[PDB]
Design a protein around this ligand. Structure first.
Ligand code: NAP
Length: 273
């Protein structure tokens, strides 16, 4: 009857979150991935541990994919109890691309797709459900690197979803027109995308409080914390599993909790910016 779901869950922190929900969540866990071969291999890996996740395909950049997942969840469970929006991209210099494309493709997944996930799936969230949007502490650095005018816009409690969408869209356009510095933006498309995820989280919490406060749904943004690099350049496995701690905490907040709501959370603590 109850069901939790994780996006981008075939490797990294998303896989660690899917594992921990299998251990800690009272209900089914749906591991999702855009690459079905990768997703099913991850499911088999957790099965080899003795766990029982379910699989569903999900590419958050594909609206038909989001809606197929939505339909599956309504049919099988009558909705959703826990949503962890973990899927993200960050393009390094080994993936050479012009800056305006880097900006466009980073915001496409991290912000616009995450937003589409929230809008398609929030209506099917059950009472006392939780939404966890994986952001990054880089979003703070990005905020600090905005002009004062932009900071005031992102910081304001009255900012609407539409205002936010338009600002994110503006970043991308400004990069296409080669004016993003003049316009007060920082240089990190990843940081800007995560700022968007953070602010979207505040907005979705206001919206839930407005339209359905008695459902007691909690939406928070989450920084899984600095991860540490190993000798071979990879994220060390322990710190990757440690990275699941705050997301899982936020996913499993007891039914009576009224806080954190719409907050940015790192190591179980609210980040004030
Ligand atoms: N690791 C860190 O140092 C760190 C620190 C702070 C915050 N974070 C955040 O924590 C989250 C997980 O990070 P990670 O380091 O574990 O990431 P990762 O190892 O790079 O894996 C990202 C996951 O997201 C998936 N993904 C990318 N685009 C997708 C799409 N369009 N649809 C569905 N899935 C998609 C990937 O699928 P494929 O395998 O098919 O690529 C993969 O499963 C991210 O939100 C990241 O921004 C990470």
């Amino acid at each position: 009857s109850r069901v939790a779901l994780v996006t981008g869950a075939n490797r990294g922190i998303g896989l660690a979150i899917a594992r921990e929900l299998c251990r800690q969540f009272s209900g089914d866990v749906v591991l999702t991935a855009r690459d079905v071969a990768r997703g099913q291999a991850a499911v088999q890996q957790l099965q080899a541990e003795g766990l029982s996740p379910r699989f569903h395909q999900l590419d958050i950049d594909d609206l038909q994919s989001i809606r197929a997942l939505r339909d599956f969840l309504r049919k099988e469970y009558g909705g959703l109890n826990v949503l962890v929006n973990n899927a993200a991209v960050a393009f390094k210099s080994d993936d050479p691309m012009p800056f305006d494309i880097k900006a466009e493709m980073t915001l496409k997944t991290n912000f616009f797709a995450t937003r589409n996930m929230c809008n398609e799936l929030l209506p099917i969230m059950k009472p006392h459900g939780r939404v966890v949007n994986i952001s990054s502490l880089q979003c703070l650095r990005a905020f600090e690197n905005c002009s004062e005018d932009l900071q005031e816009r992102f910081h304001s409690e009255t900012l609407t979803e539409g205002d936010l969408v338009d600002l994110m869209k503006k970043f991308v356009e400004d990069t296409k027109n080669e004016v993003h510095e003049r316009e007060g933006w920082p240089n990190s498309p990843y940081g800007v995308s995560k700022l968007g995820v953070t602010v979207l989280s505040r907005i979705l919490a206001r919206r839930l409080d407005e339209k359905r406060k008695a459902d007691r749904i909690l939406v928070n943004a989450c920084c899984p914390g600095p991860v540490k690099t190993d000798m071979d350049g990879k994220d060390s496995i322990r710190t990757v599993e440690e990275g699941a701690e705050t997301p899982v905490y936020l996913a499993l907040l007891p039914p009576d909790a009224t806080e954190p709501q719409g907050q940015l959370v790192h190591d179980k603590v609210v980040q004030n910016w």
